[PDB]
Design an enzyme around this catalytic site. Structure first.
Site, PDB file in Angstrom:
ATOM      1  N   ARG A   1       0.810  -1.218   0.000  1.00 11.65           N
ATOM      2  CA  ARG A   1       0.000   0.000   0.000  1.00 11.65           C
ATOM      3  C   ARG A   1       0.847   1.274   0.000  1.00 11.65           C
ATOM      4  O   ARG A   1       0.482   2.268   0.623  1.00 11.65           O
ATOM      5  CB  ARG A   1      -0.942   0.012   1.212  1.00 11.65           C
ATOM      6  CG  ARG A   1      -2.068  -1.020   1.160  1.00 11.65           C
ATOM      7  CD  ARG A   1      -2.542  -1.284  -0.274  1.00 11.65           C
ATOM      8  NE  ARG A   1      -3.759  -2.094  -0.314  1.00 11.65           N
ATOM      9  CZ  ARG A   1      -3.852  -3.286  -0.895  1.00 11.65           C
ATOM     10  NH1 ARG A   1      -2.797  -3.822  -1.494  1.00 11.65           N
ATOM     11  NH2 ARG A   1      -5.004  -3.945  -0.878  1.00 11.65           N
TER      12      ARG A   1
ATOM     13  N   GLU B   1      -6.517   5.176   7.078  1.00  7.97           N
ATOM     14  CA  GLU B   1      -5.617   4.787   6.024  1.00  7.97           C
ATOM     15  C   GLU B   1      -5.881   5.744   4.859  1.00  7.97           C
ATOM     16  O   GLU B   1      -4.946   6.229   4.256  1.00  7.97           O
ATOM     17  CB  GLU B   1      -5.882   3.379   5.562  1.00  7.97           C
ATOM     18  CG  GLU B   1      -5.398   3.101   4.135  1.00  7.97           C
ATOM     19  CD  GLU B   1      -3.868   3.000   3.980  1.00  7.97           C
ATOM     20  OE1 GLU B   1      -3.403   2.785   2.830  1.00  7.97           O
ATOM     21  OE2 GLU B   1      -3.134   3.131   4.987  1.00  7.97           O
TER      22      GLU B   1
ATOM     23  N   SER C   1     -11.793   0.459   2.485  1.00  6.85           N
ATOM     24  CA  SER C   1     -10.941   0.360   3.678  1.00  6.85           C
ATOM     25  C   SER C   1     -10.180   1.624   4.141  1.00  6.85           C
ATOM     26  O   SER C   1      -9.016   1.927   3.817  1.00  6.85           O
ATOM     27  CB  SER C   1      -9.990  -0.845   3.584  1.00  6.85           C
ATOM     28  OG  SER C   1      -9.673  -1.203   2.249  1.00  6.85           O
TER      29      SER C   1
HETATM   30  C1  LIG Z   1     -15.269  -0.765  -3.646  1.00  8.78           C
HETATM   31  C2  LIG Z   1     -13.782  -0.498  -3.683  1.00  8.78           C
HETATM   32  C3  LIG Z   1     -12.905  -1.614  -3.741  1.00  8.78           C
HETATM   33  C4  LIG Z   1     -11.507  -1.427  -3.760  1.00  8.78           C
HETATM   34  N1  LIG Z   1     -10.675  -2.512  -3.874  1.00  8.78           N
HETATM   35  C5  LIG Z   1      -9.297  -2.384  -3.855  1.00  8.78           C
HETATM   36  C6  LIG Z   1      -8.365  -3.581  -3.951  1.00  8.78           C
HETATM   37  O1  LIG Z   1      -8.865  -4.690  -4.079  1.00  8.78           O
HETATM   38  N2  LIG Z   1      -7.034  -3.371  -3.883  1.00  8.78           N
HETATM   39  C7  LIG Z   1      -6.448  -2.147  -3.812  1.00  8.78           C
HETATM   40  O2  LIG Z   1      -5.252  -2.067  -3.800  1.00  8.78           O
HETATM   41  N3  LIG Z   1      -7.256  -1.035  -3.736  1.00  8.78           N
HETATM   42  C8  LIG Z   1      -8.626  -1.097  -3.753  1.00  8.78           C
HETATM   43  N4  LIG Z   1      -9.505  -0.018  -3.683  1.00  8.78           N
HETATM   44  C9  LIG Z   1      -8.814   1.315  -3.579  1.00  8.78           C
HETATM   45  C10 LIG Z   1      -8.644   2.033  -4.952  1.00  8.78           C
HETATM   46  O3  LIG Z   1      -9.451   1.506  -5.992  1.00  8.78           O
HETATM   47  C11 LIG Z   1      -7.144   2.061  -5.361  1.00  8.78           C
HETATM   48  O4  LIG Z   1      -6.321   2.711  -4.410  1.00  8.78           O
HETATM   49  C12 LIG Z   1      -6.936   2.656  -6.783  1.00  8.78           C
HETATM   50  O5  LIG Z   1      -5.674   2.314  -7.325  1.00  8.78           O
HETATM   51  C13 LIG Z   1      -7.161   4.178  -6.842  1.00  8.78           C
HETATM   52  O6  LIG Z   1      -7.193   4.586  -8.219  1.00  8.78           O
HETATM   53  P1  LIG Z   1      -7.828   5.982  -8.429  1.00  8.78           P
HETATM   54  O7  LIG Z   1      -7.652   6.314  -9.897  1.00  8.78           O
HETATM   55  O8  LIG Z   1      -9.286   5.896  -8.010  1.00  8.78           O
HETATM   56  O9  LIG Z   1      -7.067   7.096  -7.511  1.00  8.78           O
HETATM   57  P2  LIG Z   1      -7.595   8.381  -6.813  1.00  8.78           P
HETATM   58  O10 LIG Z   1      -8.635   8.014  -5.777  1.00  8.78           O
HETATM   59  O11 LIG Z   1      -8.075   9.354  -7.869  1.00  8.78           O
HETATM   60  O12 LIG Z   1      -6.293   8.956  -6.103  1.00  8.78           O
HETATM   61  C14 LIG Z   1      -5.608   8.159  -5.138  1.00  8.78           C
HETATM   62  C15 LIG Z   1      -4.261   8.760  -4.759  1.00  8.78           C
HETATM   63  O13 LIG Z   1      -3.345   8.577  -5.878  1.00  8.78           O
HETATM   64  C16 LIG Z   1      -2.924   9.819  -6.447  1.00  8.78           C
HETATM   65  N5  LIG Z   1      -2.950   9.609  -7.883  1.00  8.78           N
HETATM   66  C17 LIG Z   1      -4.148   9.312  -8.478  1.00  8.78           C
HETATM   67  N6  LIG Z   1      -3.766   9.255  -9.882  1.00  8.78           N
HETATM   68  C18 LIG Z   1      -2.314   9.595  -9.952  1.00  8.78           C
HETATM   69  C19 LIG Z   1      -1.224   9.790 -10.949  1.00  8.78           C
HETATM   70  N7  LIG Z   1      -1.419   9.607 -12.254  1.00  8.78           N
HETATM   71  N8  LIG Z   1       0.043  10.178 -10.529  1.00  8.78           N
HETATM   72  C20 LIG Z   1       0.254  10.391  -9.200  1.00  8.78           C
HETATM   73  N9  LIG Z   1      -0.612  10.227  -8.237  1.00  8.78           N
HETATM   74  C21 LIG Z   1      -1.880   9.838  -8.699  1.00  8.78           C
HETATM   75  C22 LIG Z   1      -3.816  10.879  -5.828  1.00  8.78           C
HETATM   76  O14 LIG Z   1      -3.133  12.128  -5.726  1.00  8.78           O
HETATM   77  C23 LIG Z   1      -4.225  10.245  -4.486  1.00  8.78           C
HETATM   78  O15 LIG Z   1      -3.237  10.456  -3.426  1.00  8.78           O
HETATM   79  C24 LIG Z   1     -10.936  -0.154  -3.693  1.00  8.78           C
HETATM   80  C25 LIG Z   1     -11.820   0.967  -3.658  1.00  8.78           C
HETATM   81  C26 LIG Z   1     -13.212   0.828  -3.658  1.00  8.78           C
HETATM   82  C27 LIG Z   1     -14.227   1.951  -3.646  1.00  8.78           C
END
Ligand SMILES: Cc1cc2nc3c(=O)[nH]c(=O)nc-3n(C[C@H](O)[C@H](O)[C@H](O)COP(=O)(O)OP(=O)(O)OC[C@H]3O[C@@H](n4cnc5c(N)ncnc54)[C@H](O)[C@@H]3O)c2cc1C
EC number: 1.3.1.98
Length: 303
Positions: free
Chosen positions: A174, A294, A224
């Protein structure tokens, strides 16, 4: 702000710049206030131009994906918000796959299968973009972005391009170097192993079924929220504290998975934060255990 807007317009196509744009329209949790500037670049050069400019004039920059792993306050975000959602290409070459940071990892996982490549089935249900997955070394069911990634192309806060290989990305549980030095991810490259599609499909099918049976996938949500405290599971603690179903505003502790906070009734980023505080308080009283958050909470408080 007139000045910044005029400047940004000198650097990138105007239609790609939105002003005082409500983020709730784009976040997976459906929350978030106004972004002073919400930029949707279609090229790496545009990301560079914006980052360099902001660096020079000390303007904070917020990188965003689908917003599935943050909570943006109702006051919105001051400065520039760059959305990477348009950098969406996904291309395959034999056993290698490249994808823009805006591409949905689920889409990449599905491309892998289309080519009978095994190694990304674990991501068939992870929401969000590739950029966010790299940032968090997204992982599930034994798999991790780290298993198959070769490198990630990024732009540093000063606006330069830097190609970070697997080791340099310092992918951890993470965590990653993207977090530690605020780099913005533009693209990621993977190498997978040829596989048997029916088998690849069967794994995805099983993982999809499994997740659907355990998570409130039908509601905008933040996943989470807490760190796991010693000797216990946060979701189990929350559940044993009889917090499931507890609502504040339009957000409540999921009755399907106590570890999830669902936006069931037009809730706000303020409800999320309030509910978190309330969950931490209730658990601490019941077990004397302190849950640490978290999920990152950013943006300004309203008014
Ligand atoms: C129902 C549900 C289930 C989930 N299951 C999982 C799982 O199984 N495993 C897991 O690991 N996670 C899981 N997640 C968490 C989430 O999907 C991940 O952390 C995912 O990778 C976030 O992608 P995002 O585009 O939504 O990022 P965002 O929510 O848009 O941003 C997250 C963070 O990353 C940064 N970021 C976003 N895009 C970039 C970029 N291009 N460059 C630099 N920083 C960037 C942001 O500044 C921020 O700090 C889950 C979430 C939900 C709602």
């Amino acid at each position: 702000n007139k000045d910044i807007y005029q400047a940004l317009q000198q650097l990138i196509p105007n239609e790609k710049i939105k002003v005082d744009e409500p983020l709730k329209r784009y976040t997976y949790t459906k929350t978030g206030g106004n972004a002073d500037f919400y930029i949707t670049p279609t090229k790496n050069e545009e990301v560079q131009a914006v980052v360099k400019y902001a660096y020079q004039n000390e303007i904070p920059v917020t990188y965003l994906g689908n917003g599935s792993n943050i909570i943006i306050r109702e006051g919105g975000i001051r400065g520039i918000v760059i959305s990477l959602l348009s950098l969406d290409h996904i291309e395959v070459s034999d056993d290698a796959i490249i994808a823009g940071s805006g591409a949905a990892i689920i889409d990449v996982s599905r491309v892998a299968r289309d080519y009978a490549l095994t190694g990304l089935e674990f991501a068939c249900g992870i929401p969000g973009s590739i950029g966010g997955a790299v940032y968090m070394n997204a992982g599930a069911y034994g798999g991790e972005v780290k298993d198959c990634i070769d490198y990630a192309l990024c732009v540093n806060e000063q606006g330069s391009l830097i190609k970070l290989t697997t080791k340099e990305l310092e992918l951890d549980y993470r965590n990653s170097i993207i977090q530690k030095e605020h780099l913005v991810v533009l693209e990621a490259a993977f190498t997978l192993a040829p596989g048997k599609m029916t088998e690849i499909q069967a794994k995805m099918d099983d993982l999809t079924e499994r997740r659907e049976s355990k998570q409130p996938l039908e509601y905008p949500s933040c996943g989470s929220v807490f760190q796991r405290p010693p000797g216990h599971f946060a979701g189990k603690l929350i559940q044993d504290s009889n917090l499931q179903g507890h609502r504040i505003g339009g957000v409540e502790v999921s009755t399907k998975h106590a570890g999830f906070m669902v936006n069931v009734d037009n809730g706000t980023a303020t409800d999320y934060e309030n509910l978190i505080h309330y969950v931490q308080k209730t658990v601490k009283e019941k077990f004397g255990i302190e849950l640490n958050r978290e999920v990152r909470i950013i943006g300004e408080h309203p008014k």
